[PDB]
Design a binder for these strands. Structure first.
Ligand code: NA
Ligand code: NA
Ligand code: ZN
Ligand code: ZN
Ligand code: ZN
Ligand code: ZN
Lengths: 162, 162
DNA sequence: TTGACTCTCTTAAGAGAGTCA
DNA sequence: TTGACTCTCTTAAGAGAGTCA
């Protein structure tokens, strides 16, 4: 098994490589009618992506290192959390993009939480609009708002009460 | 089936059958420290379920009627909305349960919206805690709250800024 | 040891369609 | 015509593992 030192070395190699990705400045809603700025470190759209990186899906990548003749591989966003517990409350931990930008690999834009917590950030009003997440959101979620509901609750007869 | 009169016939027969389901009272959080009461009309746990109804999955059912000697079938929760557009902004319309109770078929607890809008109601603060859904929620979402994040954003070196 | 491809799987909100009696 | 079962698929947030040179 990899030692703590080997794991830290893996995290260091990842940061050095991701830190050289193109840095894109984005203006984003924060909630409460305010605007902020996020700086995303974005993996390239096509190969080559960077030392150790390869694409396994349309917006999925993996990071690979060979140690003592053995090949090790991790999801490209999971590396910052290799020294953390990998489950909580019986649920698997997942890399959760606070910037909602799948190509970004900035570890300051990622957290480590259940898939339900991860998903729910899509609808959060944001750090200046009422976010109650203990690890606070960086921006208002892209899907927050009144929605586009086609038809509401309704009945034709009188069989039902609310 | 095809004509307006036949579709109205399907909706009326469905309302009559579901109107005989057992009515179960559920007390629910509304947000803002307040509580309300909903009356769900719950499909039985095992067969028989009711005229026209059959189970295709653990929490999935279908309604079936024979019209013009042909069998027509729909998802158990879609029948109230058979006269509505079946898409919006190029996204499929889905039956969304405002009471978050899958066995419930009370049409006063259903709406018709994209799968993203549907999912997002799981994290809404509720009608007394700040819901902004244009078709308003009936309760606070079951997954609303601070979350259980294991690790927050972090870096080991000095290569990244927020 | 490394790059650039290939394939299938998980979750929880939702679906369509076939086999028998 | 009606009832009671069987199977796989969709979406968008996430994953693991094989092949070849
Ligand atoms: Na996310
Ligand atoms: Na729902
Ligand atoms: Zn980012
Ligand atoms: Zn938040
Ligand atoms: Zn209900
Ligand atoms: Zn709401």
């Amino acid at each position: 098994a990899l030692t703590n030192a080997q794991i830290l070395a893996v995290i260091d190699s990842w940061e050095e490589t991701v830190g050289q990705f193109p840095v894109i400045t984005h203006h984003v809603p924060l909630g409460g009618g305010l605007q902020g700025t996020l700086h995303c470190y974005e993996i390239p759209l096509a190969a080559p992506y960077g030392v150790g990186f390869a694409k396994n899906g349309p917006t999925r990548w993996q990071y690979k290192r060979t140690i003592n003749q053995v090949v090790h591989r991790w999801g490209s966003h999971t590396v910052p959390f290799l020294l953390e517990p990998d489950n909580i409350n019986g649920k698997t931990c997942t890399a959760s993009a606070l910037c909602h930008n799948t190509r970004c690999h900035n570890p300051l834009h990622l957290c480590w939480e259940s898939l339900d917590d991860n998903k729910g950030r899509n609808w959060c009003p944001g750090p200046n609009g009422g976010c109650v997440h203990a690890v606070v959101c960086l921006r208002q979620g892209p899907l927050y708002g009144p929605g586009a509901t086609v038809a509401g609750p309704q009945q034709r007869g009188s069989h039902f009460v609310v």
